[PDB]
Amino acid sequence: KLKGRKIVGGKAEGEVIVSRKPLSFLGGVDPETGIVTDAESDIRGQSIAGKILVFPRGKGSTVGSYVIYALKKNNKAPKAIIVGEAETIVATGAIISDIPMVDGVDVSKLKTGMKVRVDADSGEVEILE
Template sequence: MVPIKLKGRTIARGCAEGEVLLSKDPISFLGSVDPKTGIVVEEKHALAGKSIRGKVLVFPHGKGSTVGSYVMYQLKKNGAAPAAIINLETEPIVAVGAIISEIPLVDMLEKSPYEVLKDGDLVRVDGSGGYVEVLGRSAGNTEN
């Protein structure tokens, strides 16, 4: 496999690795995600019924209430938060939530994560360095 390293913009510092969980739907942490379990409970959401716990959560941007930042913090306190987050472009609610919860977050990658990443890929998100590195491919991702 050819190494893939994508530069982006640092939003929340730190470094974490995990399996990619992709959503093309925006996420509202208030009402869409159970803060105790990390399971997406919004019925018509692309990730409905799936857990974000320990995943590298890829979604375009957040939506909804400013309370979503605190819900992200609750997820972290409950051990149900994603390991890291990648956004197309982060808005303030998700940015604040990631920072106070110490969840590494990068956005504005040099290539769209939807073109490069697939569910189950193993990646490292380096929020301090501002990049995402693909460490391994899922069985369904034969690109590169």
């Protein structure tokens, strides 16, 4: 069990997909598909839809929060977001899209493919082995 902060509540379980690079939503993620578009992200072609996203911090344009909202309408949104440090772009996106977010977690202890449960109301991540 890894402990973090309650950014946005809710509970979710899914497949962990990890980025070790600052991820920028305006440009680097497609609102229609959920596929990463960033030229040099780890997951150049992987889609976020219905997964558990892990990445150190968001970056890029303040507008990126709106992309995350389009992902949630277009139903290609992640089930939950695990950031190293919660910032304005990603948190606002989860707040307006009702996506559960928990930051301050050791994101290095999460590798791609892990089955994982996030209780975002209390801000805790549990790895299922």
